[PDB]
């Protein structure tokens, strides 16, 4: 069966001290890393500090990766550099990159290609806007976004999909677990259509909308939701409850 | 004003290569009270690098967020840099403007955020070949500098970089010097002559052991933002040209 996968996307947050206290409270949770993946994504300049403090049961990665490889790309972190540093995971396609930094479907594709060439594991995010949903284009947008990279997947344990319901982020709308599950089912279908039943059955599809201690159980129970990419709630000590929801 | 020699490692290095490179740098005997020497590794290499380099080397990062802390996945805030005691940031490098659509307004906002968090900034600008061909060198550089020059408080703490984009992909030291003089005239007119004679203006085109002496000797060239030449142990000779 699929291994559940609970990730903390710390986004642009943290001090040396806050990370010391937060990582201390995460270490107190017993879990079995051969049964459940728990991954923490700190800011790049916090990675060494975070990786040292978190116990080995925790996996780690970074919040973005370059499409370009090594060379004259000031400000970028290459997949080669991540591999040399044994950084296990990268997030690609997060909506904040697509919103604030003009990241395109082709950038997501090229980042995934770079990541896989360097043996990184990729958490790849996509999802449709309020306008797109209101126009009844959910499946059309998600098909387009997934087919932008899906043919590159070389091992369905090592690329993890994230559904970001942009229509329920910053909009006042809240997605029900039923609504989230429906999209997850369709996402698994796109992978079945393009890659094969056995591959669709292996791939983890995480929910990446608002996750907190109160809704996490109702989401993880859904048949096609395999875990979470968590924002704000992963900056709290109570994140451990979100991890326990998947245990 | 002191000379300023910066290593922009851009997207390059391994843990092993940085060990050997940093050890060759530490072997160079120089006085940090007379010359600033700044290494800018990749964000994920910063801690590794900072630990390996003697204090005579200042260090920084190659980019900084225009937003504060919060919901900006993949960004590093000026507040975060300050908590890590990161001394310098690069802002406005032509690679950010080119590949990542960085604008003049992004540069100003990133400079505002850096100064607010006590970071010192190396801020880059420069004109394309099309612009140079149309006699727009001064007009472009004027527009780019005026985007942020009114923010500069202590003129030791913002370092200007001229990037001759028209030549990257070289400019003569004479050609470089003519631009640098114009840039200084821009700071004089907007900030005052005392401040313009205090501010460092670095050449940010191709710099290597072949041309560094010819460039630093120019009157309005105060050092360099060095690319691939700074990934080499011979970078110590580029530093020596400014000693
Ligand atoms: Na489930
Ligand atoms: Na000079």
From Swiss-Prot, chain A:
Effect the entry attributes to changing residue 95 to H: 6.7-fold decrease in substrate affinity
EC number: 5.3.1.1
Cellular component GO terms held in the UniProt record: cytosol
Keyword Isomerase assigned: yes
One GO term of the biological process aspect: glycerol catabolic process
Residues the record lists as binding D-glyceraldehyde 3-phosphate: 9, 11, 170, 229, 231-232
UniProt-annotated catalytic positions: 94, 164
Biochemical pathway: Carbohydrate biosynthesis; gluconeogenesis; Carbohydrate degradation; glycolysis; D-glyceraldehyde 3-phosphate from glycerone phosphate: step 1/1
Protein family: Belongs to the triosephosphate isomerase family.
Function: Catalyzes the interconversion of glyceraldehyde 3-phosphate and dihydroxyacetone phosphate in the glycolytic and gluconeogenic pathways.
HAMAP family membership: TIM_B
Protein name (Swiss-Prot/TrEMBL): Triosephosphate isomerase
Naturally occurring in which organism (per UniProt): Plasmodium falciparum
